[PDB]
Structures are given as C-alpha cells and as structure tokens.
Design a binder for this molecule. Structure first.
Ligand SMILES: Nc1ncnc2c1ncn2[C@@H]1O[C@H](COP(=O)(O)OP(=O)(O)OC[C@H]2O[C@@H](O)[C@H](O)[C@@H]2O)[C@@H](O)[C@H]1O
Length: 162
C-alpha cells in the first residue's frame, strides 16, 4: 500500500522501488540477482546487492565459481541471503551486447517457479541491453509463482503498468 504498484495477474505485482528494500519488507522471500557467468558483481543491481552485504555475496560467489566453473547463460544458482533475503537466486540473463538471445530469459524466469515468494529486477534490462518490455513479457509468460517485479525507474514502471 505504501508503494506505487500495479497487480498484473494472480502471480505478478509490478512495484516502483528498490528491490533490496522490497525484499527486506517481506518476512520470507528469495531475492533475484541479475548476474553474469562468473558471478563477478558489477555496476547494476549485482553490485548494489554485494555492497549491501558488505562484500559477503562476492566472497560466496567466488567460492561457488571455484566449485562449479563458470555458469552458462540462462543458468541460475541459489546462494545464501546474507540478511537481505532468505536466499539469493543469481540468474545469468542473456547479454545482448554479446549477441546472446533474449529467448534465454525463458530459462532464467522458469527458475523462479519452485520458490514461493520471489522479489526480482527485470533480468537483462540494464547493462545486458534487452528492452525492458521484452524482459517483462518473458517474465509474464514463464513465471507462475508469487513475484514482486521491482523497477527503480518511473518511466519504465509507467510503460510496463500500461
Ligand atoms: N536496486 C534496484 N532495484 C530494482 N531494479 C534495479 C535496481 N538497480 C538496478 N535496477 C534495474 O534492474 C534491471 C537490470 O539491470 P542490471 O542490474 O544492469 O542487469 P542486467 O541488465 O541483467 O546486467 C547484468 C550485468 O550487470 C552487472 O551488474 C552484472 O554483474 C552483470 O554483468 C535494470 O532495469 C536496472 O535499471
């Protein structure tokens, strides 16, 4: 009720705000990180998640990548929450700058469905250069669990809420 939000369907609510703040409000949730294949948390939400954890997220991510090797595009990994959420689901969206197809967002978003409550940004819609409407369409087509899709730009919010 405190946020500009639009309930889209029985699964998805679009929220204008900061995904970290929304994840903190909910008593139980998974927070989704928009990651790269090496979980090297850069200039988008990944860096903000890492900084909010005091670097704990990057330390854990490095440990995982040593155990797994690099992820494939479209893969995800459930790691610890570090007080931000019950857990963080790191998803590797396609990077359009590297000619990776937006269709791989199907794999990213399907990974949400085993989790009861998900708080997510729009995967690939920032640095990875996929149209926010395209990412949101893949989200709506594939997500079948209670999901708060949090966007921090009001113009994007207005576009997607219409
Ligand atoms: N705190 C936030 N809350 C909600 N949405 C946010 C927030 N910060 C950024 N966003 C939005 O989330 C969307 C995803 O943007 P990025 O975080 O840039 O994600 P992506 O486009 O998937 O790029 C992934 C790449 O960026 C690096 O951070 C990461 O390490 C990877 O290399 C964009 O629309 C961006 O504006």
């Amino acid at each position: 009720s405190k946020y500009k939000h639009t309930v889209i369907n029985n699964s998805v609510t679009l929220v204008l705000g900061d995904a970290i703040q929304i994840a903190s409000l909910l008593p139980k949730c998974i927070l989704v990180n928009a990651a790269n294949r090496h979980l090297k948390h850069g200039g988008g939400i990944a860096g903000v998640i890492n900084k909010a954890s005091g670097g704990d997220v990057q330390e854990e991510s490095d440990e995982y990548i040593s155990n797994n090797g690099p992820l494939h595009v479209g893969d995800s990994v459930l790691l610890k929450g570090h007080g931000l959420a019950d857990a963080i689901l790191h998803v590797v969206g396609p990077d359009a700058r590297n000619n990776e197809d937006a269709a791989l967002l199907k794999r990213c978003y399907k990974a949400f469905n085993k989790h009861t409550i998900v708080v997510t940004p729009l995967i690939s819609a920032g640095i990875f250069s996929v149209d926010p409407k395209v990412s949101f369409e893949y989200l709506l087509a594939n997500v079948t669990t209670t999901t708060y899709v949090v966007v921090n730009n009001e113009d994007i919010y207005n576009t997607l809420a219409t």
